[PDB]
Design a protein around this nucleic acid. Structure first.
Ligand SMILES: NCCC[C@H](N)CC(=O)NCCC[C@H](N)CC(=O)NCCC[C@H](N)CC(=O)N[C@@H]1[C@H](O)[C@@H](OC(N)=O)[C@@H](CO)O[C@H]1NC1=N[C@@H]2C(=O)NC[C@@H](O)[C@H]2N1
Ligand SMILES: [Mg+2]
Lengths: 117, 109, 103, 54, 142
RNA sequence: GUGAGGGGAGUGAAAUAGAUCCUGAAACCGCAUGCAUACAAGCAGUGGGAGCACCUUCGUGGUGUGACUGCGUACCUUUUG
RNA sequence: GCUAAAACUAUGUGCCGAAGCUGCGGAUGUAUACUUUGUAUACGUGGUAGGGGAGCGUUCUGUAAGCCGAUGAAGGUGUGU
RNA sequence: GGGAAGCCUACCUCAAGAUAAGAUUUCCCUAGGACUUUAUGUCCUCUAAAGAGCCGUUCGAGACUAGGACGUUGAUAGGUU
């Protein structure tokens, strides 16, 4: 029962090379190089699925800081005021409002100042 | 419509013939023939043979006018190689590759 | 007019007629869902910020269906340590269409 | 001395970017109406209104 | 994609003019860098230049505290052997005042193509006159 | 060039079955089209993300490309490492 | 870059900050009950040398004088799922 | 206030890829149609300037280049006197 490896080996190599599409030079042509590139891409993606949440929260915080400073507060004081006022709107929605609706963000800042008073 | 001529097994490197191919790519047939007739390259003779064959094909099998023709497509491909042994000093031997090429010329109006 | 609702441990700012995907819900396709815990309602100049929640506000949505997001590959590899493992993932979602907002 | 790494096809082509051939200076001869290399006798022996071979 | 990025075609760069007379160098430079990068706008985006144009006038009147006027050193290296050149704040502010602000703000801006693009929006002038009256800058007190 | 080689014609179900001729993979080498690229420093990807071209069920859509940006020093073996 | 500090000492309000904790969705192992189950609750699921458990594909024999196939098998090359 | 063969100038050469790409003098190009993507828009027709280069005779310039002179309205090279 002699077994020839050609068909299955070719399928596996072709699948790896297909996942390596778009890479530079030997990384999209040569199996030994392409296989390392795919694994490292997977490792990077696993790490960056965690990094993405941090980066987007940092962006929301920066935009909220800009809005609060336009309304006469700092970010930390505005967050403290909202907590004391019991408002539980999260930073993603707060930054969306800060970017797209200035009047509503002004109202939120006024509520935060009123609670801080 | 394009009319094709292929010269296969020309005894010259594809890298060397591609310079003449790029020299005449896209030009009108009369200008290309002048360039080939006054070039001093070896590949010019082979490229001229292929181009004249393509012009004759377009004239005889397709009844196209000569004055409207240009070199619409041209490229050179690697052919079969010949392998030889060159004896070096101190009993060492090297392998020599004698390269050939395929020339494809298409003319159109 | 737009409102702020909470679904699936997250929050969304929605308008009437908007289609959005949230975490998987147990409601049947074609059913109607009502959010009674609206956090904020804005009607241009009428701005209501709920202390926790705007009293009396309602958001009404219709369940379009259920589905799965695109496949994600998980890859783990410790170099020089002879260790490797892989797995796939597709997250479930429920699709909603906002049909009503009442402050 | 020899390379430590094989040169990529991109770098090889970048080196070859200066290898293109050029055109000769060809002009039409007034005496015969034929194309000839400028400042050279034609292949039939004519130059500047003179004939070389009878 | 409910969090949106600012689009470069919709960015508006406003022009401001700032007087440097009597200001502390670093405490002015921080605000200049902040407004050049655009941290003061609710549309701030890390990969987009959303900042403003800052004209600086009376650049040679900027101040440092302590003994920094004589002791703060500015170095540079020509890449020839032994080619380290050195000056100080007193000589540099009298000779080439624009270089002081350029260094101070360059050190506080990001170090990349976007940072190079950002720092082009700062115009520094020694005297009390600037050539940008056509852009109608507003007075900014910082 | 009475060469090699090819274009027609003809045969054949098939000639990209045309002679080292069934199928014709990969390394490697051309031509064509689309986008990017000549002020910017590094394992070349990854998470974001503008613009452009084609397609379109006109979009909260598909395909190709990827300015700008956070992070990021291959694999195996042997080792305390 | 910083000098009534962006340094040091003491005190107080806030905030940022991890794959830790919480929220929402999903998978899996063990135990306890449902006195069949495949349903609930509780507690677990970083790993080298190693030990244990469960599977995917390849060639050949029977099932097979069966079933699919020139209205197109195997193989090759794309696309979708 | 004074104060060194030391520092910055001063002397010589290079220097706007100084992408912040600078300044001055002088010279050149001023035409008609169609259409929709109403725009430094796409096809036609007509125009080809000031200059630059190819080529040639060459050099006290030179690896190849680059640089300098000249091309009949001419002494650029050879010859001749
Ligand atoms: C120990 N005493 C010193 C020693 O051995 N000296 C000789 C150097 C040997 C060298 N190290 C290895 C080498 O060059 N092998 C080549 C190789 O196998 C092959 O060429 C390629 N390219 O693959 C072949 C071509 O047919 O030629 C061989 N070489 C040959 N050398 C030969 C020669 O001179 N005469 C007779 C026959 O032996 C010839 N073949
Ligand atoms: Mg011998």
């Amino acid at each position: 029962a002699r077994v020839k490896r050609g068909v299955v080996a070719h399928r596996r190599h072709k699948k790896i090379l297909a996942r390596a599409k778009g890479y530079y030079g030997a990384r999209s042509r040569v199996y030994r190089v392409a296989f390392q590139a795919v694994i490292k891409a997977g490792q990077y993606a696993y790490r960056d699925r965690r990094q993405k949440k941090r980066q987007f929260r940092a962006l929301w915080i920066a935009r909220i800081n800009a809005g609060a400073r336009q309304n006469g507060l700092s970010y930390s004081r505005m967050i403290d005021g909202l907590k004391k006022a019991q408002v539980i709107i999260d930073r993603r929605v707060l930054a969306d409002i800060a970017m797209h609706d200035a009047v509503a963000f002004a109202a939120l800042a006024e509520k935060a100042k009123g609670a801080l008073a | 419509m394009e009319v094709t001529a292929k010269l296969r097994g020309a005894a010259i490197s594809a890298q060397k013939a591609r310079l003449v191919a790029d020299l005449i790519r896209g030009k009108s047939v009369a200008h290309a023939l002048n360039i080939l007739n006054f070039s001093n390259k070896k590949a010019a003779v082979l490229v001229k043979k292929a181009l004249e064959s393509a012009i004759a094909n377009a004239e005889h099998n397709n009844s196209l006018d000569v004055d409207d023709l240009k070199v619409s497509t041209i490229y050179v491909d690697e052919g079969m190689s010949l392998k030889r042994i060159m004896p070096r000093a101190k009993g060492r031997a090297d392998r020599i590759t004698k390269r050939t090429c395929h020339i494809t010329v298409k003319v159109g109006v | 007019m737009y409102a702020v609702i909470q679904s699936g441990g997250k929050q969304h700012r929605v308008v009437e007629g908007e289609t959005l995907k949230v975490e998987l819900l147990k409601a049947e396709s074609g059913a109607t869902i009502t959010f009674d815990d609206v956090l904020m309602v804005v009607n241009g100049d009428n701005i209501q910020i709920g202390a926790p929640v705007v009293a009396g506000a309602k958001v009404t949505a219709e369940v379009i269906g259920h589905g799965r997001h695109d496949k994600i590959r998980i890859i783990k590899m410790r170099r020089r340590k002879h260790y490797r493992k892989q797995q796939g993932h597709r997250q479930w979602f429920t699709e909603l269409k906002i049909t009503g907002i009442s402050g | 001395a020899v390379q430590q790494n094989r040169k990529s096809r991109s770098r090889r082509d970048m080196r070859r970017s200066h290898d293109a051939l050029t055109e000769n200076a060809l002009t039409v001869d007034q005496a015969t109406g034929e194309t000839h290399r400028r400042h050279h006798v034609t292949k039939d022996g004519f130059y500047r209104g003179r004939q070389l071979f009878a | 994609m409910k969090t949106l990025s600012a689009k470069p075609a919709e960015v508006q760069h406003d022009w401001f003019v700032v007087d440097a007379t009597g200001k502390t160098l670093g405490r002015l430079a921080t605000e200049i860098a902040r407004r050049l990068r655009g941290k003061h706008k609710t549309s701030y985006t890390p990969h987009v230049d959303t900042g403003d144009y800052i004209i600086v006038i009376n650049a040679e009147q900027v101040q440092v505290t302590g003994n920094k006027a004589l002791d703060k050193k500015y170095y540079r290296h020509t890449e020839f052997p032994g080619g380290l050149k050195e000056t100080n704040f007193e000589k540099l502010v009298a000779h080439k005042p624009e270089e002081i602000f350029e260094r101070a703000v360059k050190g506080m801006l990001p170090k990349g193509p976007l940072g190079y693009a950002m720092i082009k929006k700062m115009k520094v002038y020694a005297g009390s006159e600037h050539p940008h009256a056509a852009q109608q800058p507003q007075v900014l007190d910082i």
